[PDB]
Amino acid sequence: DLASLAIYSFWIFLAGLIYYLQTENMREGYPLENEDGTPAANQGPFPLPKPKTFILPHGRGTLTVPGPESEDRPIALARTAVSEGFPHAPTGDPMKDGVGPASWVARRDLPELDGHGHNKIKPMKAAAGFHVSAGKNPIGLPVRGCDLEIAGKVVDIWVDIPEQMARFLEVELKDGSTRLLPMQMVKVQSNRVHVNALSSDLFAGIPTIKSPTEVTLLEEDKICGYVAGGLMYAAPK
Amino acid sequence: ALLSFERKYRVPGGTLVGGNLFDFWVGPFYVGFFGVATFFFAALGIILIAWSAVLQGTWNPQLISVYPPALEYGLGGAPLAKGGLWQIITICATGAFVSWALREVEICRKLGIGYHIPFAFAFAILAYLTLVLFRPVMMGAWGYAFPYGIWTHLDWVSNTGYTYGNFHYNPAHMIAISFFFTNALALALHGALVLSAANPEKGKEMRTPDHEDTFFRDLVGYSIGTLGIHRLGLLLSLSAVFFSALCMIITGTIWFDQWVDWWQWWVKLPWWANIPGGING
Amino acid sequence: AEYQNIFSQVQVRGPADLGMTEDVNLANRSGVGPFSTLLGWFGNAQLGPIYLGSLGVLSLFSGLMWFFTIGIWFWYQAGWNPAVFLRDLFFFSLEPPAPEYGLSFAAPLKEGGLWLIASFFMFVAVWSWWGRTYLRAQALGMGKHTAWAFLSAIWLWMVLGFIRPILMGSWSEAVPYGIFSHLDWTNNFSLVHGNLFYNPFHGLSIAFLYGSALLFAMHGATILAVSRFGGERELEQIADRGTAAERAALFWRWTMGFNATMEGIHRWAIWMAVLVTLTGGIGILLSGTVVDNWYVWGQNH
Numbered sequence: 001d002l003a004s005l006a007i008y009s010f011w012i013f014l015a016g017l018i019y020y021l022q023t024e025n026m027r028e029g030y031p032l033e034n035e036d037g038t039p040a041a042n043q044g045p046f047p048l049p050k051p052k053t054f055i056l057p058h059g060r061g062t063l064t065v066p067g068p069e070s071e072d073r074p075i076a077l078a079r080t081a082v083s084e085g086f087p088h089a090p091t092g093d094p095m096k097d098g099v100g101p102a103s104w105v106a107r108r109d110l111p112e113l114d115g116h117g118h119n120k121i122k123p124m125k126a127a128a129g130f131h132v133s134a135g136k137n138p139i140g141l142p143v144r145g146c147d148l149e150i151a152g153k154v155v156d157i158w159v160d161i162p163e164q165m166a167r168f169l170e171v172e173l174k175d176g177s178t179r180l181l182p183m184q185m186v187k188v189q190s191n192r193v194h195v196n197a198l199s200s201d202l203f204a205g206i207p208t209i210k211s212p213t214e215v216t217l218l219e220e221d222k223i224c225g226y227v228a229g230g231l232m233y234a235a236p237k
Numbered sequence: 238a239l240l241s242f243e244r245k246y247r248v249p250g251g252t253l254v255g256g257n258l259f260d261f262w263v264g265p266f267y268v269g270f271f272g273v274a275t276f277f278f279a280a281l282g283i284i285l286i287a288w289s290a291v292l293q294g295t296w297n298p299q300l301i302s303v304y305p306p307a308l309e310y311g312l313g314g315a316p317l318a319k320g321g322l323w324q325i326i327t328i329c330a331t332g333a334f335v336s337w338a339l340r341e342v343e344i345c346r347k348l349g350i351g352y353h354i355p356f357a358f359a360f361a362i363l364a365y366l367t368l369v370l371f372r373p374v375m376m377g378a379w380g381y382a383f384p385y386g387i388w389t390h391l392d393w394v395s396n397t398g399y400t401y402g403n404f405h406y407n408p409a410h411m412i413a414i415s416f417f418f419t420n421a422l423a424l425a426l427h428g429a430l431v432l433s434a435a436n437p438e439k440g441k442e443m444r445t446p447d448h449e450d451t452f453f454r455d456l457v458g459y460s461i462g463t464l465g466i467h468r469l470g471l472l473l474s475l476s477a478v479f480f481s482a483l484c485m486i487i488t489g490t491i492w493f494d495q496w497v498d499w500w501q502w503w504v505k506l507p508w509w510a511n512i513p514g515g516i517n518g
Numbered sequence: 519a520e521y522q523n524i525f526s527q528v529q530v531r532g533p534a535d536l537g538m539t540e541d542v543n544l545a546n547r548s549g550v551g552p553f554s555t556l557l558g559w560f561g562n563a564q565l566g567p568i569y570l571g572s573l574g575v576l577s578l579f580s581g582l583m584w585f586f587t588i589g590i591w592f593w594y595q596a597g598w599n600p601a602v603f604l605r606d607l608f609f610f611s612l613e614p615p616a617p618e619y620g621l622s623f624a625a626p627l628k629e630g631g632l633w634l635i636a637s638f639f640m641f642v643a644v645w646s647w648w649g650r651t652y653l654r655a656q657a658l659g660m661g662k663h664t665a666w667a668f669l670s671a672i673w674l675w676m677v678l679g680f681i682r683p684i685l686m687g688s689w690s691e692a693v694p695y696g697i698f699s700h701l702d703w704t705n706n707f708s709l710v711h712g713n714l715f716y717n718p719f720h721g722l723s724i725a726f727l728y729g730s731a732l733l734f735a736m737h738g739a740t741i742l743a744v745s746r747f748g749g750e751r752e753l754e755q756i757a758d759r760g761t762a763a764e765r766a767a768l769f770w771r772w773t774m775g776f777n778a779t780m781e782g783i784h785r786w787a788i789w790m791a792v793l794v795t796l797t798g799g800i801g802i803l804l805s806g807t808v809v810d811n812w813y814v815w816g817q818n819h
């Protein structure tokens with residue numbers, strides 16, 4: 001029967017489709033490793049995908065995946081048990097070491113570029129015509145931590161020009177320096193900006209950026225990682 | 238085993254119950270208190286299904302069917318073989334689904350991310366609870382819930398539906414369907430767009446988000462944006478399930494007739510109700 | 519409580535983005551439209567510009583004619599009475615020619631001929647639009663994933679209104695142009711073929727339709743959960759994996775035992791959705807042409 005041949009054929013096609021999808025989804029992180037970093041014996045029934053290349057715009061080079069996988073950065077963690085399956089505890093300051101919920105990835109120390117080769121993210125004071133068009137404007141507002149103490153004041157807004165959206169709030173600290181705060185980790189209010197992830201004294205520990213007009217992917221990851229990590233490492237305060 | 242970048246994330250903490258007593262993984266799976274709880278409920282639920290199968294006299298997954306108590310049992314407990322199994326299995330499932338959600342929450346805490354996922358999963362649980370608990374309770378009997386059988390639960394959908402004529406006329410059902418269709422449309426478009434940007438024409442450099450925007454702008458005159466599309470996808474699928482639970486929680490509780498009759502608040506309207514002509518005149 | 523990033527807290531507005539040029543013929547790109555603060559709370563506020571080429575205009579022209587043919591017919595059914603028009607709007611229906619006419623085009627206007635005319639226009643409108651989704655991607659140097667995914671939806675539509683009717687021998691088998699009437703056609707179609715629940719392709723189609731809501735809920739929530747690390751910027755995460763892509767992957771690996779990649783999740787997405795209409799088209803195409811009763815068919819196989 002045709003209907004019978006059809007459905008039978010579809011299930012064959014589907015098994016082949018799933019096989020393809022799973023291997024496509026192994027272009028990052030595989031092969032699997034033992035907790036000591038060495039390759040793991042069991043890699044599953046699905047084989048490693050064959051290399052594919054991405055030619056990045058603006059002479060940024062080419063990415064090949066799968067490929068030599070390495071965390072080009074030290075990991076301040078230690079095994080908690082002999083066997084596998086147990087937590088690895090931070091050897092130092094998780095927040096400062098960038099581990100656990102405060103982890104960051106060694107991305108390119110370059111700014112994400114827009115389609116025309118310009119910095120994607122930029123402080124409003126450097127983006128002609130950008131302004132708050134709705135909602136409360138956090139600029140000039142005090143930034144308060146989970147300790148209820150004021151850590152500083154909002155001196156600017158870093159916007160994703162292409163998407164026209166607020167991504168970072170630049171906060172000036174007592175020492176007079178500034179730090180970027182992810183927009184999705186703050187709560188803008190009528191009189192202040194509340195940050196539940198950090199305590200006022202921890203804002204200084206937020207990794208700093210080199211240029212005052214741009215931010216690299218590497219820095220964005222350190223900033224975001226550090227801030228999100230406060231939810232677990234700055235909660236006691 | 239671990240993904241090459243996973244180790245730095247497998248730190249202690251994030252639990253809601255049991256401190257570090259269950260703070261560990263089994264293979265890739267995180268356990269946690271809710272993990273052992275899920276295993277418990279799931280194991281007991283599966284064992285009871287197997288028991289119901291021994292009673293049914295079949296091992297075929299196509300025939301095994303666990304029916305709820307008869308309507309005569311109202312909301313009371315029933316004997317294992319006559320619906321009790323369905324009642325206990327329903328309790329185990331609810332415990333398993335809820336525990337699964339709380340386990341996700343712990344996972345969210347350990348990774349320091351938002352709780353959007355378990356929050357979203359809760360809508361599905363509420364939809365399940367609507368058909369198996371809320372509606373049955375409001376109608377006065379567990380027997381109004383669906384049976385646990387691959388094909389028998391479809392017959393249930395059919396019988397329940399036709400009990401009200403053509404279910405297509407349930408206005409809340411229309412809305413849910415529109416969200417379901419619009420969702421699949423949006424998922425297809427979003428997957429396509431990203432892929433078309435990351436895997437451009439041959440002989441071209443990987444596209445940027447701007448190309449995605451320009452594409453949808455040229456095509457339909459508006460780009461919701463990278464953030465917007467994920468927000469929309471979540472909203473479409475959640476709204477679909479919401480209107481699903483809604484179209485069922487009102488059927489047989491505040492509505493009892495053929496759903497097509499509902500549309501009279503528009504047709505039989507006093508004035509034009511009698512104007513000659515059209516389809517209803 | 520915490521912020522959820524479902525709606526923006528503070529909207530920002532700057533110069534309108536005219537878009538990438540690439541090989542797009544700017545001669546057909548309109549000017550920029552106004553900003554919608556209302557839309558700005560959920561997504562972007564910029565409206566337009568839009569592109570209109572020869573194919574788009576043709577598509578718009580045909581589409582409007584399709585709408586005009588159905589509308590004019592509705593007025594006729596309403597007796598040109600505005601009141602009757604608004605009350606029976608959803609009850610009006612432009613039905614296909616009766617069976618007697620087979621696949622003939624000789625059906626009288628008031629008895630199916632107008633349906634054929636409306637279908638001609640819809641056929642041109644859809645395919646022209648399909649060519650357009652292909653051309654818009656080509657001009658920007660993008661892959662043709664959108665045109666291919668669109669072909670899947672078009673496939674179900676082609677089967678419902680043209681392919682199956684032709685193999686069945688009459689236009690009477692096609693779907694009528696009416697809100698409630700096409701709903702009744704759908705219900706009748708199932709009763710006539712022995713319960714569509716037993717059409718395995720319908721079952722698969724449901725699994726993917728349900729699976730699409732499951733997958734987008736999973737994906738939408740996941741990206742929002744890691745938006746605090748710039749997760750929504752998926753293309754860059756693909757080019758240079760960040761903690762956002764890693765945390766998202768680990769959340770799922772720890773939850774269900776396996777995960778995706780920032781790029782691979784979109785292949786899962788495009789296929790989950792595409793399979794909906796793909797399997798659905800097959801199931802409908804096989805109905806009445808090869809299988810008359812699905813329930814019965816299923817008991818024997």
Ligand code: BCL
Pocket residue numbers: 334361362364365367368393394395397398399403404405410413414417477478480481482483484485704705
């Ligand atoms: C003849 C039948 C009637 C009809 C009768 C009914 C009835 C009766 C119902 C629907 C319902 C629905 N109908 Mg209808 N329906 C008809 C025709 C249609 C048509 C159409 C093209 O014709 C469409 C598109 C729909 C669409 C729909 C959906 C909106 C809705 C189902 C989604 C849902 O509730 O998800 C909700 C999601 C869930 C219930 C899933 C729960 C998930 C749980 C939490 C997780 C499970 C975990 C698992 C056990 C673990 C597995 C382990 C494995 C190893 C992985 N109907 C016809 C006219 N319809 C249902 C509804 O609204 O329900 C609320 C419903 O009850």
Ligand code: BCL
Pocket residue numbers: 283286365368383387388390391394715720721722724725726728729732
């Ligand atoms: C929501 C409206 C109705 C309903 C209407 C329909 C209709 C109509 C159809 C299905 C179909 C299915 N339904 Mg149902 N279904 C309902 C509620 C449920 C529940 C529940 C706990 O709520 C479950 C687990 C299922 C499960 C299923 C799957 C077996 C099948 C494929 C759907 C799919 O892939 O979705 C997307 C989900 C995924 C892709 C995730 C993977 C889910 C796997 C496939 C589900 C495993 C179910 C499993 C066998 C239960 C035993 C596990 C325990 C170990 C014992 N339904 C309610 C009552 N269902 C289709 C079919 O062919 O049925 C025969 C079908 O046509």
Ligand code: BCL
Pocket residue numbers: 394418421640643644671672674675678703704705706707708709713714715719720723724725727794795797798799801802
């Ligand atoms: C009594 C009714 C029968 C039944 C009869 C049918 C029939 C008959 C069909 C389905 C089909 C479907 N059914 Mg059913 N179905 C039943 C019960 C159910 C239940 C349930 C009880 O829970 C569920 C979940 C479903 C689910 C489904 C879907 C998986 C599937 C539709 C795919 C889709 O997205 O189409 C929506 C998408 C399209 C129609 C694509 C068309 C797109 C065109 C190209 C766009 C035109 C746009 C236009 C030009 C104008 C608008 C543009 C504006 C300018 C914006 N059915 C009951 C048992 N069902 C369809 C299928 O494939 O079945 C195998 C189908 O034909």
Ligand SMILES: CC[C@H]1c2cc3[nH]c4c(c3C)C(=O)[C@H](C(=O)OC)c4c3nc(cc4[nH]c(cc(n2)[C@@H]1C)c(C(C)=O)c4C)[C@@H](C)[C@@H]3CCC(=O)OC/C=C(\C)CCC[C@H](C)CCC[C@H](C)CCCC(C)C
Pocket residue numbers: 275278279280281282283326329330333334337341354355357358359360361362384385386387388390474475478728729731732735736739773774
């Ligand atoms: C609210 C919108 C949509 C949605 C979202 C959603 N689903 C989710 C999530 C989210 C956000 C998860 O995080 C979670 C997940 O982990 O995904 C991989 C999940 C999930 N959605 C699932 C299924 C599912 N979701 C569905 C639907 C939807 N999910 C929506 C469309 C459907 C249907 C029918 O449409 C199904 C079948 C699971 C794969 C997974 C949750 C896994 C889980 O809870 O595991 C714990 C339990 C077990 C391993 C087994 C329990 C054993 C029971 C004791 C017995 C079974 C009895 C059962 C009631 C009978 C079923 C018989 C049928 C034939 C009727």
Ligand SMILES: [Cl-]
Pocket residue numbers: 570571572573574575650653
């Ligand atoms: Cl065009």
Ligand SMILES: [Fe+2]
Pocket residue numbers: 427431467737741752784
């Ligand atoms: Fe995405």
